[PDB]
């Protein structure tokens, strides 16, 4: 039988419509269908292993990233589970089919390469890769959570939850994530 | 819980204790901490002596509860409290025990440094000039005259 996520979230409840992300994500594999986002896997070894990482394992990783406070996946797996419960209680959708969308949206499609010649700082038009795109997307999403999450009674599992939602919506006023997603392209569309 | 009945009056936002000790409305033990003499754990002790509710908010205690504390501090040893939980123990070669009050404490010190100012002991002289006594290292330590000795909140 099908191993649901956290015990209650069918993986086959999602599909990657765009071809871009098809190989640069995890929902799709048999091996990916995990109960727990903890694999102590050995990704990050070859030069593209990162791929085969169950999308959420990646989220958890990028999540335990602030110095002193972090470095302990144990907990982070939690902050992500609660956040999924919370995302569900609002749109009652398969929260992976949410987080997933968000991942696809929050990734800038264009960036500018700083190429300076003798003091002058010029830039060019650059198209952002897929692996890079997803990486940026998650990094971004989480990046923001902490932003508000600080001296706030709002919790990461809440901040994050509230983020993954709007990040899927493209709501440019409710996602520190998509703000840059747009600006980076905009500024980049200027330098180009 | 916090199932108050007569809001604005069935409660007292600020209580008066030992002179300038005004109290905050949150939790009782902790509220006590503002008193220059009681702290994190001493407050908790107090509530076990006066059988007063700890978990319960602050200010849900009448003047009886207030005096229970003013005198509890005047001769603490009387209600019990082992000699070793007190702030002051065996003073000036005679005075047995006390419990450094918000105002008592302030002057007790003014008298001991005075006790030493006249004596002219190293540790004594140190306080006068204004320099750590035990913390010894002066090279890098507290520069731009940071907080010397004896500290008062403001």
């Amino acid at each position: 039988t099908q191993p649901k996520l956290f015990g209650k979230w069918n993986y086959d409840e999602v599909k990657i419509q765009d071809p871009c992300f098809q190989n640069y994500i995890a929902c799709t594999t048999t091996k990916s269908q995990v109960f727990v986002p903890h694999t102590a896997g050995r990704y990050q070894v070859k030069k593209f292993r990162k791929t085969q990482c169950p999308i959420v394992e990646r989220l958890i990783g990028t999540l335990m990233f602030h110095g002193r406070n972090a470095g302990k996946k144990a907990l982070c797996i939690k902050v992500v589970k609660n956040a999924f419960e919370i995302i569900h209680l609002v749109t009652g959708r398969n929260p992976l089919e949410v987080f997933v969308g968000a991942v696809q949206n929050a990734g800038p499609r264009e960036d500018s390469t700083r190429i300076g010649t003798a003091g002058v700082v010029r830039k060019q038009a650059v198209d952002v890769a897929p692996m890079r795109r997803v990486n940026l997307a998650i990094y971004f999403i989480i990046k923001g959570c902490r932003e508000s999450a600080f001296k706030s009674m709002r919790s990461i599992a809440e901040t994050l939850a509230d983020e993954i939602i709007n990040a899927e919506k493209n709501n440019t006023q409710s996602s520190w994530a998509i703000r840059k997603k747009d600006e980076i392209e905009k500024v980049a569309k200027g330098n180009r | 819980m916090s199932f108050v009945i007569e809001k604005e009056s069935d409660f007292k936002y600020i209580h008066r204790i030992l002179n300038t000790n005004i109290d905050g409305k949150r939790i009782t033990p902790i509220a006590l901490t503002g008193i220059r003499g009681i702290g994190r754990r001493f407050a908790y002790i107090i509530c076990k002596v006066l059988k007063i509710d700890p978990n319960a908010r602050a200010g849900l205690l009448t003047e009886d509860q207030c005096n229970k504390i003013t005198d509890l501090i005047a001769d603490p040893e009387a209600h019990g409290i082992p000699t070793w939980l007190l702030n002051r123990i065996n003073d000036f070669k005679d005075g047995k025990n006390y419990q450094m009050a918000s105002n008592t404490l302030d002057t007790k010190m003014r008298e001991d440094l005075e006790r030493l100012k006249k004596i002219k002991s190293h540790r004594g002289l140190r306080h006068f000039w204004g320099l750590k006594v035990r913390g010894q290292h002066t090279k890098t330590s507290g520069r731009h005259g940071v907080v010397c000795g004896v500290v008062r909140k403001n």
Binding site: - | K93, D94, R115, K118, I119, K120, S121, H122, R123, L131
Partner: protein, 125 residues
């Protein structure tokens, strides 16, 4: 209208009590801080006793003309004894001897606590 710690006399009877043997009778013991009690209850020296008597003669022989004979010592480790009050002992610090008038307050405290061992810093450049 000023008084003294625990009664300067009670102690002269407390120290020179029935058994005025060891400079610090177990009586005075109850009075001192743990560190001091530690030392005496541990192993205090005898030299500290002949130094004692040296102040003794200085306190009496001197007329009420309040001119005490300064007693010199390196025993900066000595903890002022009750009967040691009133005399002016010269204590070495590093350079010379320091003359200090012993007040009732400096008892139980180390005799060294008054012989400044270094001149703190003045400044300019």
């Amino acid at each position: 209208f000023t008084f003294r710690g625990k009664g300067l006399e009670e102690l002269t009877a407390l120290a020179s009590g029935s058994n005025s043997e060891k400079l610090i009778s177990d009586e005075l013991a109850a009075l001192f801080d743990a560190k001091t009690r530690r030392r005496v209850k541990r192993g205090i020296s005898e030299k500290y006793a002949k130094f004692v008597n040296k102040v003794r003669r200085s306190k009496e022989k001197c007329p009420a003309g309040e001119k005490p004979v300064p007693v010199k010592t390196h025993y900066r480790s000595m903890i002022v004894i009750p009967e040691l009050v009133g005399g002016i002992v010269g204590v070495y610090n590093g350079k010379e001897f320091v003359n200090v008038e012993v007040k009732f307050d400096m008892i139980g405290k180390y005799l060294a606590e008054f012989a400044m061992t270094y001149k703190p810093t003045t400044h300019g450049k």
